[PDB]
Subunit: 414 residues, 3 copies
Amino acid sequence: YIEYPVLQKILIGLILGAIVGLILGHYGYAHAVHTYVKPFGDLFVRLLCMLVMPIVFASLVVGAASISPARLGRVGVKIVVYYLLTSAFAVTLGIIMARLFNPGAGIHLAVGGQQFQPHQAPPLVHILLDIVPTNPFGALANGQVLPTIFFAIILGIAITYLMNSENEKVRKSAETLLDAINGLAEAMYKIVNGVMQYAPIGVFALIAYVMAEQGVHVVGELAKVTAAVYVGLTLQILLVYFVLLKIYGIDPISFIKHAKDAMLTAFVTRSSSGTLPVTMRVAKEMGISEGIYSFTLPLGATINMDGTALYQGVATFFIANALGSHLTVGQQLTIVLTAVLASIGTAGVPGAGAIMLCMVLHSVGLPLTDPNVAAAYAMILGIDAILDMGRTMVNVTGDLTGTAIVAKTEGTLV
Amino acid sequence: EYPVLQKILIGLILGAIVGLILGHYGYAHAVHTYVKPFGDLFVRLLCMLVMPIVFASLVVGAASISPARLGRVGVKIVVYYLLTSAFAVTLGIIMARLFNPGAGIHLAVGGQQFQPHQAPPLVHILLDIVPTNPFGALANGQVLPTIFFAIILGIAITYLMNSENEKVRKSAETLLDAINGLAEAMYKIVNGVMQYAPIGVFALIAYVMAEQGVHVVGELAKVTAAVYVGLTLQILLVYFVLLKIYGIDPISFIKHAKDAMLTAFVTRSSSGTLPVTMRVAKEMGISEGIYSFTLPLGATINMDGTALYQGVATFFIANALGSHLTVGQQLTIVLTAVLASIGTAGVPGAGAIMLCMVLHSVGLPLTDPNVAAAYAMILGIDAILDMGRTMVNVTGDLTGTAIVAKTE
Amino acid sequence: KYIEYPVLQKILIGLILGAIVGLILGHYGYAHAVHTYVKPFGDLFVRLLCMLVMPIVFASLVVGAASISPARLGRVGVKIVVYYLLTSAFAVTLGIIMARLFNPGAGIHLAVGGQQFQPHQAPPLVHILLDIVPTNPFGALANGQVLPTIFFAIILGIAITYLMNSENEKVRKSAETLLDAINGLAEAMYKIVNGVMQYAPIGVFALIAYVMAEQGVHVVGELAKVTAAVYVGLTLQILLVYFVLLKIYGIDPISFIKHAKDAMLTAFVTRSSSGTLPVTMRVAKEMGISEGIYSFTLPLGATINMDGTALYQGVATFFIANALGSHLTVGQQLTIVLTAVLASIGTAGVPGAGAIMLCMVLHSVGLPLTDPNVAAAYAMILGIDAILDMGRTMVNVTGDLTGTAIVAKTEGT
Ligand SMILES: [Hg+2]
Ligand SMILES: [Hg+2]
Ligand SMILES: [Hg+2]
């Protein structure tokens, strides 16, 4: 059948696809690929941008409700502060690395015969006022990004306040609504898994055309991306986690020795949740309180922002850079912080890195319909699989780093 | 608030007489200005629920039929309906080509004939089944994407009900429970709208008769006929053969269903009839533990009745527009319609509701005067057709529960 | 850094303080600078409100419809509903009456862009009646078609009640779940308003600051003229209907008020049918209303009481239309006003329902809230809504008791 290690399939689809593309590039048929292979790629891209709205919205409602004070616990408030200070660093490293290696420059895409031309921007007044949806159903209906973010947050928070009410009529109503929204977000995730079953074919078709038509330069450019990620990735573990543990009297060396297979599971399954049974067992091996890890671990699975913050730092810069538009530090963080803010509750979430990207593009007015934007996004989407293994692996490590720092601040260790 | 079907038939029979005399020496135009708006109110009220029912109905439907959520006695009854609908489709088209309903009524209302557009590149029509934004598809009536999303969602929910996580599992249970109920309410609303249907159906044919001459009655009777003969040809040609193939006697089988069919034929309700259906299944000696499960499904998932309705209706509608339609597209459009109606067996006037959904999905704006005036015709006789629809649905539900019961 | 100080106080402070600032900056000041710098805060406030107008009206009506819906409706229910229908009827007539009595809007002929607003007119009745029916309800709901939304929200709520009358427990829990989540969306939308009223002091400051600075000093008289027309019709309701209705039911009106005294005073000051509900029930027991009666009728008047809104709209509608330059007749008025009221059912409060309905009414008529004039006209009412909304609630609560007592003594079982 096709149930064989889904990730194996996708990496086979990428490696094999680039070879097919690239040799049909050299003496081949850039155009034939474009007429015949590519539409299979397009289907894949559509199946992704599809759920981009339901997941962002329904995910944020649930996510907001999670962190919403003071439905949030006191042991919880400390773990929230944790992810906030780490996301802060994860963002800096993101940008830093994306500037350090310069992914995108060197590939000047001008696909229809013309380069893409960002039309910016309205007056700040006009753009701040417009985050407030004129009509919340409509925002959601026709893909209005920022408004949906803002309404989804303000609603998730509202729900929690309703679950602090004496009126039981009221309390269950909220509990019902949130539960229903939850199941939606939940179903959306299961749908993604199904799409990832098609991903090996679709991703084959995507890079096949990119390779066939962009030339061979691309492979260097993509390795440039992945590199900037995995080096910021490990730079995170070493520079922040290890420091934060050191600074909490915890031993970083022996810490790793327990996390070892929990990171390796995460690296391999791409799944904060798939990995969560392993994570929890390791948390116990380190001797974290039962009452603690059984609460804080199922959070970092969803609200851990550090992984995605790194992805976007590099994805953002590549995507904008390949388009040809030179992007500054101020725009960078502006963009990235906003993606991260809105990512909360989508930690995994199969391929959230790429999903946030769409939602961020849609937000900066770069129509996915444009051929350049399209062929640009298609590149990152290709290697997303690779990137998403590091993304999860850092997520999990940081979840343990945090749940162990917070564990010790409760006096429940060994 | 007196027997509802009586009223719709009273209104139709009565309405054509009124329209037809007022047509002849009368004032086709007057009717058009004063009588007709009541008719248009009716068509709107229907096209209204076309979206919610299709979406909500399919989410629920797909979650029924979904693997691994489906049961063993269930898998067989589904396999039953799949292979009966197969044949029901064939008869539909076949009868629709046999009698030629529509041609000979050449409607060109505005002083101009309707002119269907075809067709974007296969590539572009296939990529487009995938909604770019699901809320959007839903919001501004995109048919194929809504089907595609509603199926892919229903299946997803079932996987969530096979989860270790009780939080996850309850949430799915809830979402589904609320979509169901939306579905459910949608139907309740139809029952009420059918309360206006006698006035509405009066107004509709009144105009059609007053304006399209007397040729119409022949053309409509042509439809009715093509359904009722496909209808009984289904009972005899498939059910009887399936009963015989499973040692059940066709003749004495009917002797038991006799009132259950008569009830179905007169209530238009697979569900309204359900108590009578189950009573007969007991009289025939089916296991309690089998008919109490399989009969409530046939009432929702039985595609055979609709499959004949769409076959014929589709061919009439298109044919009357002027557009001659081939066997290939006939089937393609039909499979699509039936394969989206799952979980709406009855569901009062489902037959017509689907038609609207298939029309909106295949070019053909319901706002267009030709398209409108043609759909107004079938909408008129829907009541007649919808009685045979249900009656055959119910017969095939017993045939299925009996065949499956025997294998147990 | 914490302004969790009495929320109403803040809005009143913001109004009085805002008008002075604007008015002095108006005279020799910088109408323009206010427009460029203070106003954007006033606009952000109008956006947060106009935001919820769709979800509150829809999800609110669904629940509302369900609550009045037969035959889920009790016999103790049927009477209280009939009560409210006959009181809203009069509540409307007084609204229009007072709106015509004082003439708010005239004398302020607003032509803001350098051009006066022009209401379009009306398609044939056929076309407007057919169009109350949503061709696609998700679409109605998604892009703000008001009339089709109303009609779908009612026809939905009612259907949901019938599903609760089914022997199929599948069917029955399904309906119960759906309603449970629609309510609760409703409920959350209300919580989101409470947060918006938190910024309302700042926003209401900015709003009148500009209208004062730019519209002159004639505005303050015109607004006092509104509030007057409401508060007098408001007490004309108590004296002219409730008191005549209590008397006509052998009940003593003066000694009735002696119990309601604080129950009305709470409502006047909290702006909250729900916040006041504890105080209200305590008073219905003091008046010696049955426990199994007020435990049902008081939580209804809290949501379905239409009389308070009926007055507000009578005046708001006339002022808004009058200021724009369109003179509006008594037919037009009720047609506009019945409609709003009839669709307000289940939104009694709901922090600021009065203004909320008005948008929804403005959108429905054909006055695009983006229009410079319409905006500057709505902005004025939005400003004093807070004042009007205290009276609104207070009248509502008096009439909930007047009702629960009239129905109560017709019982004694
Ligand atoms: Hg996308
Ligand atoms: Hg329709
Ligand atoms: Hg508004």
